[PDB]
């Protein structure tokens, strides 16, 4: 039975999934903050 | 409402606010996985039957 | 520097098809990640050394 129920579905992995895409999420969101200007006249540092 | 907890009632200072941008939505998702939590921790706690 | 757009990186050529009126690629984060060269009308990839 436990066999089939991970053969069946990924849903019950969920709780080591949401580990790894909370860790994805932070970094693609630390590098999102990157196009901030935060009112600076650039938000890309060569162009200052 | 981060944008109005910031800027009270203005669309001027709601377009400043949109050059930080992500920092808000970061915030609301964080409060978000708290609001969360609270549920599952009263399911984990009496729902046992 | 292309056309004042100073940084330190590689070039290489580029698969990115800019449509004429376009200069400039870019990443996620706002920084260039490809140019269109000013003489030899062809696209570069940068990527910093």
């Known amino acids: 039975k436990i ?10 992995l969920g709780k080591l999934q949401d580990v790894v895409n909370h860790n994805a999420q932070a970094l693609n969101t630390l590098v999102k903050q990157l196009s901030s200007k935060f009112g600076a006249i650039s938000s890309v540092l060569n162009d200052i | 409402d981060c944008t109005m907890y910031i800027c009270g009632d203005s669309t001027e200072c709601s377009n400043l606010l949109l050059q930080y941008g992500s920092f ?4 609301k998702r964080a409060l978000t996985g708290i609001a969360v939590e609270q549920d599952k921790n009263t ?4 729902a046992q039957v | 520097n292309f ?4 940084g330190t990186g590689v070039l290489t050529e580029s ?4 449509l004429p009126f376009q200069q400039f690629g870019r990443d996620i984060a706002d920084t260039t990640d490809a140019v269109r060269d000013p003489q030899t009308l062809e696209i570069l990839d940068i990527t910093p050394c």
């Open chain 2, 43 to 46: 399911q984990e706690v009496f």
């Open chain 3, 15 to 18: 698969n990115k098809k800019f």
């Open chain 2, 24 to 27: 808000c939505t970061q915030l």
């Open chain 1, 3 to 12: 066999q089939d129920s991970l053969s069946s579905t990924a849903s019950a």
């Open chain 3, 3 to 6: 056309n004042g757009l100073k």
